[PDB]
Design an enzyme around this catalytic site. Structure first.
Site, PDB file in Angstrom:
ATOM      1  N   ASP A  34       0.883  -1.185  -0.104  1.00 53.73           N
ATOM      2  CA  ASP A  34       0.128  -0.108  -0.041  1.00 53.73           C
ATOM      3  C   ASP A  34       0.893   1.208  -0.092  1.00 53.73           C
ATOM      4  O   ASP A  34       1.352   1.658   1.053  1.00 53.73           O
ATOM      5  CB  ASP A  34      -0.832  -0.172   1.176  1.00 53.73           C
ATOM      6  CG  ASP A  34      -1.800   1.002   1.494  1.00 53.73           C
ATOM      7  OD1 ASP A  34      -2.007   1.982   0.423  1.00 53.73           O
ATOM      8  OD2 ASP A  34      -2.440   1.396   2.382  1.00 53.73           O
ATOM      9  N   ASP A 221      -1.347   5.649  -5.385  1.00 49.63           N
ATOM     10  CA  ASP A 221      -1.903   4.641  -4.463  1.00 49.63           C
ATOM     11  C   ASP A 221      -2.070   3.059  -4.829  1.00 49.63           C
ATOM     12  O   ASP A 221      -3.318   3.124  -5.519  1.00 49.63           O
ATOM     13  CB  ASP A 221      -2.795   5.305  -3.695  1.00 49.63           C
ATOM     14  CG  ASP A 221      -3.618   4.796  -2.680  1.00 49.63           C
ATOM     15  OD1 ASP A 221      -3.077   3.656  -1.965  1.00 49.63           O
ATOM     16  OD2 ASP A 221      -4.675   4.753  -1.852  1.00 49.63           O
TER      17      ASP A 221
HETATM   18  N1  LIG Z   1      -4.681   3.208   0.366  1.00 45.73           N
HETATM   19  C1  LIG Z   1      -5.301   3.045   1.464  1.00 45.73           C
HETATM   20  C2  LIG Z   1      -6.604   3.323   1.264  1.00 45.73           C
HETATM   21  C3  LIG Z   1      -7.745   2.992   2.271  1.00 45.73           C
HETATM   22  C4  LIG Z   1      -7.113   2.331   3.358  1.00 45.73           C
HETATM   23  C5  LIG Z   1      -7.886   2.016   4.636  1.00 45.73           C
HETATM   24  C6  LIG Z   1      -7.636   1.440   5.827  1.00 45.73           C
HETATM   25  C7  LIG Z   1      -8.378   1.226   6.799  1.00 45.73           C
HETATM   26  C8  LIG Z   1      -7.964   1.499   8.067  1.00 45.73           C
HETATM   27  C9  LIG Z   1      -8.762   1.284   9.161  1.00 45.73           C
HETATM   28  S1  LIG Z   1     -10.048   0.500   8.465  1.00 45.73           S
HETATM   29  C10 LIG Z   1      -9.520   0.545   6.644  1.00 45.73           C
HETATM   30  C11 LIG Z   1      -6.008   1.302   5.956  1.00 45.73           C
HETATM   31  C12 LIG Z   1      -5.122   1.665   4.716  1.00 45.73           C
HETATM   32  C13 LIG Z   1      -5.710   2.016   3.450  1.00 45.73           C
HETATM   33  N2  LIG Z   1      -4.928   2.490   2.525  1.00 45.73           N
END
Ligand SMILES: Nc1ccc2cc(-c3ccsc3)ccc2n1
Length: 375
Positions: A34, A221
């Protein structure tokens, strides 16, 4: 880097993951790659959706940091216990580093029911790490503790169908791309922030104040599927895509991602999307171009329909532009942290027909590119 080629796996719409090991003896875990976040965080309890989880009691090298972390997102959350341990990437550089690890002990709408990963590898910068920038991200630890060069690159190949790709850690593999790399500067080291200076649909300029393109951010991203655009820009882009594809009409909901459209397929009716990015040199830009095969994604998940239904993978956003997989699956992407820049080249594995191709072209002259950044 041949040992690193094709080290990324996944299922359609569920992200790309890389095999990692944590602790001593090594515990094998699949970890989501990520570029949109900065925490290395793994499931540490028997959540019933998880195939495997980090068992701290089994590791001799585990160290407690005596600190909790709470991470809410729009939808849900994850929560965990901070510590350090030894981490390896079996299909990466032959190295072992002590990295910060959030042991996830509670989550909601974080893990995906049905996916093959159990953790997340945030590849962005300390500034957006939780709870604060004192928590050194994994890649920073990797570079400090070894001679691994300060860069990584991603080839995301797309095709529930299996997806594949490569994360080349510490360098560039020249056979994963054709033509030349073109670089856009990292505007600030937090997210991978860049500046879009011009948007065209089928070579047709949108003519908007270029500041709208980067309101309040534009980022690269690997953790997002869609090309996300600010609402004002999305509104214009959609209008312009609709006019370009007159030959057939579609309900308002489809463009809004509220419903799918199905066939039994015509790519030519749909326009190419071009983004012009700030180049390396004063008044110089370049452009990246994607096809409908990048922004019109197949949905195989349809149980109530035995046709070829697609989702419109461009959507509105209030967090800025997000260059997700829709963009990244067209291109080999070089995250060149050493020189505060991001490189783009046509991907050797990108999905195209025989009439049109994803493209990376330049140089172009574009004045007042500074002004396209939001302050
Ligand atoms: N690039 C991204 C996009 C959305 C994301 C959502 C979370 C997450 C944290 C708590 S619940 C969901 C974490 C990392 C993420 N990274």
């Amino acid at each position: 880097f041949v040992e690193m080629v094709d080290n990324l796996r996944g299922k359609s719409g569920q992200g790309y993951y890389v095999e990692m090991t944590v602790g001593s003896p090594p515990q094998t875990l699949n970890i989501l790659v990520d570029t949109g976040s900065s925490n290395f965080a793994v499931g540490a309890a028997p959540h019933p959706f998880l195939h495997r989880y980090y068992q701290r009691q089994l590791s001799s090298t585990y160290r407690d940091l005596r600190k909790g972390v709470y991470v809410p997102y729009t939808q849900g959350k994850w929560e965990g216990e901070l510590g350090t341990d030894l981490v390896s990437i079996p299909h990466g550089p032959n190295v072992t580093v002590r990295a910060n690890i959030a042991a996830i002990t509670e989550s909601d709408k974080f893990f995906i029911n049905g996916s093959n990963w159990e953790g997340i590898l945030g590849l962005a910068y300390a500034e957006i790490a939780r709870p604060d920038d004192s928590l050194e991200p994994f890649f920073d630890s990797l570079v400090k503790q070894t001679h691994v060069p300060n860069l990584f690159s991603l080839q995301l190949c797309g095709a529930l169908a299996s997806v594949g790709g490569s994360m080349i850690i510490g360098g560039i593999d020249h056979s994963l791309y054709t033509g030349s790399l073109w670089y856009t500067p990292i505007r600030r080291e937090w997210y991978y922030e860049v500046i879009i200076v011009r948007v065209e649909i089928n070579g047709q300029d949108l003519k908007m104040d270029c500041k709208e393109y980067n309101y309040d951010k534009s980022i690269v991203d690997s953790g997002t599927t869609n090309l996300r655009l600010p609402k004002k820009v999305f509104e214009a882009a959609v209008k312009s895509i609709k006019a370009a594809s007159s030959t057939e009409k579609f309900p308002d909901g489809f463009w809004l991602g509220e419903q799918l459209v199905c066939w039994q397929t015509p790519w030519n009716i749909f326009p190419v999307i071009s983004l012009y990015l700030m180049g390396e040199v004063t008044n110089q830009s370049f452009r990246i171009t994607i096809l409908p095969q990048q922004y019109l994604r197949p949905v195989e998940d349809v149980a109530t329909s035995q046709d070829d239904c697609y989702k419109f993978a461009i959507s509105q956003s209030s967090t800025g532009t997000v260059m997700g997989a829709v963009i990244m699956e067209g291109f080999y992407v070089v995250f060149d942290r050493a020189r505060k820049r991001i490189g783009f080249a046509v991907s050797a594995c990108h999905v195209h027909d025989e009439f049109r191709t994803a493209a990376v072209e330049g140089p172009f002259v574009t004045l007042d590119m500074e002004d396209c950044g939001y302050n």
